[PDB]
Structure 1
Amino acid sequence: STIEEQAKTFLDKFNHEAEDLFYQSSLASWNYNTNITEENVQNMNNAGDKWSAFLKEQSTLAQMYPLQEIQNLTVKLQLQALQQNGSSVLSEDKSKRLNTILNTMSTIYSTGKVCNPDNPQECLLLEPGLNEIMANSLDYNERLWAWESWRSEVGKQLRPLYEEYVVLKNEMARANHYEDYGDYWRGDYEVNGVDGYDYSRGQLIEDVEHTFEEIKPLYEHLHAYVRAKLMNAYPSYISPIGCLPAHLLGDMWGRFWTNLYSLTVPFGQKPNIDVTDAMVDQAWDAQRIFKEAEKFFVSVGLPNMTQGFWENSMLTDPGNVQKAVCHPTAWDLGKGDFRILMCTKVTMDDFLTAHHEMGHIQYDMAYAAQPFLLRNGANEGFHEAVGEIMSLSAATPKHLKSIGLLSPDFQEDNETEINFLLKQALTIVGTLPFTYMLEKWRWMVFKGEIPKDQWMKKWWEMKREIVGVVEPVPHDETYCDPASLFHVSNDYSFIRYYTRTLYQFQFQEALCQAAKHEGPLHKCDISNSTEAGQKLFNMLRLGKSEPWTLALENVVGAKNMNVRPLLNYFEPLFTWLKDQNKNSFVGWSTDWSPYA
């Protein structure tokens, strides 16, 4: 009869057939990931083509129902999600060109091999070897060679491709009633139609700047401390008044600073909190790791894993004969089928990753009641954030002592908390300026603020201004330095890490306040608290049915993203860094003082 009832029946038929097709596609992808064989690749390609064609046909058919005659919020949300053209609005030639460009960028990044001139008999790929070289070397010219050679080859190959990519994506986005591709990415956080909880695309950049302005003193102090320690490690390269050399940050691109913990340790004399040896001595299998994680999740009041999870997951490397992707990934295959694909080793990192992925599984299980097209997080930040809070809680010494992995007579003094907080800052705080600078640069590129001939001159200027990292040698416009990273080269949003990082500490403060924890925020464990689990599950059950602002009100009691929980988390470390930086100068100069 009415348009709303027609849309509801169409959504019901769509959900029913979509869930089955998504299951078939997801199962084919799972069979490829756990078994890399050519027939599995063919099955994955066939299932993906069927899934894409089905999404194209339902997108074509969903648009015939006008949005303004529907009053139900959930139905309008599903219809808004389905009615996106995607690449279909663009011409077939340009769509094929864009797909070809994406595929060739994927092949160039995945199979990119670079080695030293005059010794070309064997070369190293980035993921097997260059990462280890960047993470472990202490040699200035070797790191400089690897960084410059990889950016030379990858940037010179990818620069015309990126120039075509920005134009095609901007054309598609403006054809879809967006300002640019950056507006298309920012549209994920857009809430329209809800009274009071509306959020605009333009508000996101202002909120990110407002939070980053408060992030900046802590990052400046951390940068000064890391600069002083790197000056101790490398005597002449680093200037007291200038920025850090780009190739000395411990990773290939500067994404994380977690590989500088050895060089920048506050108290080397004190022991670490490594629990690897304890699991090795007691013969803890990966199955025991996941059972302990399940015990942690039942302690807080969340549902335990299904029998199908234990039966169908691959929690150990299969063997030499069968090849599998080693990256830990949680799979929500559909129809109540939840699996984890991780090649689990006996390490602390794998244990925390197991907690993180089981948090992903719990989040997936929670919104199973929702309709198929709403079975996602409210935004891209929440999905990662709910795993990261488990990663925070599991890593605490109280959790390790409770489960027996740490000695009951371990002395928790201030020095171990300071060095642990510094490691957490290098992993978590350090990625925030890089993420903000990269996303702001990409937004300015899509918006047309920066012309193509001035991309790099602004970019390094941004990096000195924001990240406090100086280029080793000046780069001209023949380079394509941003596209050397996995996410940007393969058409992925990057603001999810920034939002995840802020939401992580906001959720952590909310659950710790719910659990009546009486100490420091970093010493908080959310085990044994039913009320904290209930407060979490209230947001978890919603999925994408409600706005992210309402979900944040449900958890933390605020209608906007907040920066205060992160600063509260690192407050002992902030005071310690302020004490240690009395002689040194906090802040950096954008001039070429260290090296150029």
Structure 2
Amino acid sequence: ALVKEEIQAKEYLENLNKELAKRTNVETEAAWAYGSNITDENEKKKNEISAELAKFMKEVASDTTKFQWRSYQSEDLKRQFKALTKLGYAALPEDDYAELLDTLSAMESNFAKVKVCDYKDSTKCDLALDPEIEEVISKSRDHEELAYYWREFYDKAGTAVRSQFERYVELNTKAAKLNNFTSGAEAWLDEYEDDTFEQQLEDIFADIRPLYQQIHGYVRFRLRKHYGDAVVSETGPIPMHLLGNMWAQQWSEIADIVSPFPEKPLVDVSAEMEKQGYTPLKMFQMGDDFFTSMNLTKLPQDFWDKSIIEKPTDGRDLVCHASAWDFYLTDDVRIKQCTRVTQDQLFTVHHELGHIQYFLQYQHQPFVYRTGANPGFHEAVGDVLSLSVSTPKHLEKIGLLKDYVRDDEARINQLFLTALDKIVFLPFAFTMDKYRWSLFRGEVDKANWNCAFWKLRDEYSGIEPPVVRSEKDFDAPAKYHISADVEYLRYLVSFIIQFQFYKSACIKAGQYDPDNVELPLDNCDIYGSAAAGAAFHNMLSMGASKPWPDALEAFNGERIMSGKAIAEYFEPLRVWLEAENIKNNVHIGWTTSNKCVS
């Protein structure tokens, strides 16, 4: 009978979940040791534990076929069993999985070990991306210096791993097909449990795209005034090295030269943070304070004891891209961040702590449910907090923003500053996965892989390399997530839904009313709000126990991913910017780039 089997299956699941948590703990520990301390010994250790867990997963997926799980009454049991059938890379034969792991660590370690020579001193060749190269990219307004560092980094972080990337694509595809997905694109998209998900994102992107064009047009206009027309053309794609970010994914670092009202205040609290003697420790303690202030969970002692919150000062190689870690026990959660005392880093701290909070909220769930409702939810949590921390309202409370007058012009500056991070990012994030999807799906011949990347960057973002590239170069892996095999659509989803969360959290906190001029969405602070915290607790505690629309419904009663909230936030900027571009006869749109030779 199926009644007796379903009872037996429940007990099978309870034990197996706990076993998976314990085995994953061991893998995570080895991955932590390697990430904190890159060596051949730690690489070998990390990959061997992974190979071992993969083998166990194979046995698990095989064992699910012994249960008539599709016949069960309990939606919960069926959901758990379905999650267990999904093997990912662990579906690969033993030798193929080991090869994939070796390729993956070859790419991640290459990225982490990149060092370039000083622009002014060909003798000093120990400049790493974080912090040395990024310091220049964010601060230099010498266009040739910027171009030098761009070329050096992309040559070393990108082109150097072409053959490894090729083999990774092959094995990623082989794995996907062994799970009966068409390609790795479909395997990734499966995490969103919605067969129209791509179309939904296309529709939302199409609605916000006109606002992006206006911001792009205005930024290009302002850059021409700064650099002159020899460096920036009116009608062409923006040379990306001028945008204050190695990947041009966010442009806030150049706000001081492109701000709507240069004579009015522009929020940049980095200097005040340094003046008040801020430390990484203080920044994390402040993040903790924000969460607990909303009646959410305090960081456990293991976090403080075991986290790495500063770049180590010995000679060691490590991964400095900020990350948050769930060790799948109780309260063993960690962050590794090479924290610097800057405004952007203060947001990053809150982003990472958002992951940590999610871990703590769902750690009581069975193992397979100890993850985000979808990957976008996990990325959105910290950013909702970061949105309110970024407000003049909050920054004045914590003494970081002084003598600030919030008039109509200062408001436009702040909205524009936010847009330089939030709207600009949308086409960037979309192209990261449109590119990899196209390779996974076999839609681009290997002969055309590099210019296929830049074609997308041109088409969607209207940016281009500072120098002519060709198929001799291979630029995609110069972005961390591409070298490290981390799906990127999560961030596009995050940047849309975080505004749904923020709007609703602000309304619940009595911080936003569309008919009250004193409560604008763009100055909402949710600090200290137990009502906003309740909504978070209701949603995050669910983990992946239910399909994501149910998790969204738990937060604010809605079930649909929508661009309404983000457009609402930026509406006063849209009205002003459209008018300003008309007033200044600003050219909108761009010609096709000449910077990638076929």
If the length of structure 2 is used for normalisation, what is the TM-score?
Answer: 0.86
Aligned to 2:405: 411
Say if 1:35 and 1:125 are closer, same or farther in 2 by CA, change over 3 A.
Answer: closer
Amino acid at match of 1:572: P
SS in 1 for 2:546: coil
Q: 1:390 aligns with which of 360, 385, 390?
A: 385
Aligned: 1:178 with 2:171: no
Say if 1:65 and 1:218 are closer, same or farther in 2 by CA, change over 3 A.
Answer: same
Report the more deviating stretch, 99-108 or 423-432.
99-108
Give the superposition deviation at 1:84.
2.0
> Which stretches in structure 2 are left out of the alignment for 5+ residues?
514-518
The whole-number CA distance in structure 2 between the counterparts of 1:324 and 1:60 is: 37
Say if 1:592 and 1:349 are closer, same or farther in 2 by CA, change over 3 A.
Answer: closer
Aligned to 2:536: 536
Aligned: 1:166 with 2:169: yes
Amino acid at match of 1:302: L
Q: 1:208 aligns with which of 194, 201, 204?
A: 201
Say if 1:512 and 1:456 are closer, same or farther in 2 by CA, change over 3 A.
Answer: same
Aligned to 2:589: 588
Report the more deviating stretch, 529-538 or 180-189.
529-538
The whole-number CA distance in structure 1 between the counterparts of 2:21 and 2:120 is: 55
Give the superposition deviation at 1:438.
2.7
- TM alignment of 1:325-344, pairs within 5 A: 328-333=322-327, 334-342=329-337
Q: 1:488 aligns with which of 471, 482, 485?
A: 482
Amino acid at match of 2:164: L
Aligned: 1:560 with 2:560: yes
- Cα-to-partner distance string for 1:412-455 (whole Å, 9 max, x where unaligned): 22233222222221122112112212322222222233333344
- TM alignment of 1:18-167, pairs within 5 A: 18-27=20-29, 48=50, 50-115=52-117, 121-123=123-125, 124-152=127-155, 155-167=158-170
Aligned: 1:372 with 2:367: yes
The question of whether the paired residues in 2 share the 8 Å contact of 1:137 and 1:143 is answered with: yes
Aligned: 1:300 with 2:303: no
Amino acid at match of 1:536: F
Say if 1:133 and 1:283 are closer, same or farther in 2 by CA, change over 3 A.
Answer: closer
The question of whether the paired residues in 2 share the 8 Å contact of 1:239 and 1:594 is answered with: no
Give the superposition deviation at 1:209.
0.9
The question of whether the paired residues in 2 share the 8 Å contact of 1:237 and 1:595 is answered with: no
Say if 1:515 and 1:68 are closer, same or farther in 2 by CA, change over 3 A.
Answer: same
The question of whether the paired residues in 1 share the 8 Å contact of 2:138 and 2:253 is answered with: yes
Aligned to 2:218: 225
The whole-number CA distance in structure 2 between the counterparts of 1:96 and 1:41 is: 12
Amino acid at match of 1:174: K
The whole-number CA distance in structure 2 between the counterparts of 1:281 and 1:132 is: 19
The question of whether the paired residues in 2 share the 8 Å contact of 1:245 and 1:594 is answered with: no
The whole-number CA distance in structure 1 between the counterparts of 2:282 and 2:267 is: 20
The whole-number CA distance in structure 1 between the counterparts of 2:105 and 2:312 is: 29
Amino acid at match of 1:550: D
Amino acid at match of 1:234: Y
Amino acid at match of 2:568: N
Aligned to 2:357: 362
Aligned to 1:509: 503
Amino acid at match of 1:442: R
Aligned to 1:400: 395
SS in 2 for 1:263: helix
Say if 1:283 and 1:442 are closer, same or farther in 2 by CA, change over 3 A.
Answer: closer
Give the superposition deviation at 1:528.
3.9
Q: 1:234 aligns with which of 222, 227, 242?
A: 227
Aligned to 1:195: none
The whole-number CA distance in structure 2 between the counterparts of 1:428 and 1:188 is: 24
Aligned to 1:196: none
Give the superposition deviation at 1:388.
0.7
Report the more deviating stretch, 275-284 or 227-236.
275-284
SS in 2 for 1:570: helix
> Which stretches in structure 1 are left out of the alignment for 5+ residues?
191-198
The whole-number CA distance in structure 1 between the counterparts of 2:525 and 2:300 is: 25
- Cα-to-partner distance string for 1:348-389 (whole Å, 9 max, x where unaligned): 444434433333332222112211221111111111101110
Aligned to 2:516: none
SS in 2 for 1:581: helix
The whole-number CA distance in structure 1 between the counterparts of 2:159 and 2:330 is: 46
Amino acid at match of 2:462: G
Amino acid at match of 1:189: Y
Report the more deviating stretch, 139-148 or 242-251.
139-148
Amino acid at match of 1:231: R
Say if 1:284 and 1:481 are closer, same or farther in 2 by CA, change over 3 A.
Answer: closer
The whole-number CA distance in structure 1 between the counterparts of 2:157 and 2:269 is: 39
Say if 1:479 and 1:377 are closer, same or farther in 2 by CA, change over 3 A.
Answer: same
The whole-number CA distance in structure 1 between the counterparts of 2:89 and 2:45 is: 24
Aligned: 1:464 with 2:464: no
SS in 1 for 2:333: strand
The whole-number CA distance in structure 2 between the counterparts of 1:264 and 1:30 is: 41
SS in 1 for 2:324: strand
Report the more deviating stretch, 137-146 or 521-530.
137-146
Aligned: 1:352 with 2:347: yes
Amino acid at match of 1:359: G
Aligned to 1:264: 258
- Cα-to-partner distance string for 1:107-136 (whole Å, 9 max, x where unaligned): 333334455999965534444533333323
Aligned: 1:430 with 2:433: no
Say if 1:265 and 1:537 are closer, same or farther in 2 by CA, change over 3 A.
Answer: same
Aligned: 1:453 with 2:456: no
Say if 1:176 and 1:36 are closer, same or farther in 2 by CA, change over 3 A.
Answer: closer
Report the more deviating stretch, 255-264 or 345-354.
345-354
- Cα-to-partner distance string for 1:81-109 (whole Å, 9 max, x where unaligned): 22223234334444344333323223333
Say if 1:397 and 1:144 are closer, same or farther in 2 by CA, change over 3 A.
Answer: closer
Give the superposition deviation at 1:492.
1.5
- Cα-to-partner distance string for 1:387-420 (whole Å, 9 max, x where unaligned): 110111122222233345545x642222332222
The whole-number CA distance in structure 2 between the counterparts of 1:440 and 1:430 is: 17
The question of whether the paired residues in 1 share the 8 Å contact of 2:235 and 2:591 is answered with: no
Say if 1:23 and 1:514 are closer, same or farther in 2 by CA, change over 3 A.
Answer: same
Say if 1:162 and 1:330 are closer, same or farther in 2 by CA, change over 3 A.
Answer: closer
Q: How many residues matched?
A: 585
Give the superposition deviation at 1:214.
1.0
The question of whether the paired residues in 2 share the 8 Å contact of 1:314 and 1:342 is answered with: yes
Amino acid at match of 1:211: I
Amino acid at match of 2:150: W
Amino acid at match of 2:421: T
Report the more deviating stretch, 258-267 or 470-479.
470-479
Give the superposition deviation at 1:300.
2.4
